[PDB]
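Objective 1.3, modelling of assemblies. Example input:
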Amino acid sequence: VPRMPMIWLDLKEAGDFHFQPAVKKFVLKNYGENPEAYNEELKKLELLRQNAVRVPRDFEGCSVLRKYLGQLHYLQSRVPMGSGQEAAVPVTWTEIFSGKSVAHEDIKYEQACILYNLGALHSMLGAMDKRVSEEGMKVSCTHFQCAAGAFAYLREHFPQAYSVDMSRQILTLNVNLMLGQAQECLLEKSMLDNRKSFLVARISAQVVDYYKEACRALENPDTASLLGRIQKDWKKLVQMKIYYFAAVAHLHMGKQAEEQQKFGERVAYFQSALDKLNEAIKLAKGQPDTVQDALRFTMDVIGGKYNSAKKDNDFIYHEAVPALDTLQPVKGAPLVKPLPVNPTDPAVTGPDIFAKLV
Amino acid sequence: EALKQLAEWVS
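Predicted structure (tokens):
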């Protein structure tokens, strides 16, 4: 089946973070040393920052953002630059939806934006691949789970939002959207393997559940005014995907009834899948050719399998076609997660830049 | 059967 396009998030634009004067001033008082013994280490971290905030849009930009995020934790453990702390300096980033600069004298604000950009870059890497190879499907699934993990970590360990693009209602939308796209990649994988029809139906039902939570978030008035046109572009794709994968789920439920020799049940599920897919086609008006190619392929599957099932039942089996309400819905199978973020993993961080400052 | 294969696949 042709693959649907994916949503990705833009990275935030960074401003100034003059940590050099503050760090040199704190080592002189508190640690009692000459600040100019740390010129080479302050240059290391600034170079690290300029490369983290002007990060290349590939797989290793993630290891650069991770390294800088971990070294920020190292620095804060040795120099107090948090909110209200002795050596805090202004941290400036641009809020994504307004384009306005927001400043906080808190190093945890810098970590929040770096972590936000980690998840956003993962969402770009997940959405860039064509997912034609099983290996491309696996990297997209991991990327979306990593994006969900960064936004989830950001929503828990920074419970007060430094800017509205990182509030908990927006972050929850981001996690639910990234988990739906991760689950969607796994749905592609389970269908390429030719797994059992019931299992595929459970996986596809979970894709619907994630996108329904993202849709409910996008229908909240607070979210729509902040995202602007973005809310209208995302939801048009999400609403259509809700019905598309609802059709995919019932198509595989009808294939299970076929294996169960319930041919009256099989017509009912195929009829439901075709109705939901026709709804997806109607909601997909104006969508790019990637979306339409996927819907045209799926209709060839569902359309022919519905006609053949009704023909077999009307002429061979004569089994009662149940209404859709009388048969139990498909329970989703959540197999994807926000994958955890360890900021201070020494393997991704390398040595502590300021290890000498004791 | 298959879910133990896909659970490792997802990570």
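DSSP finds one helix and no strands in chain B.
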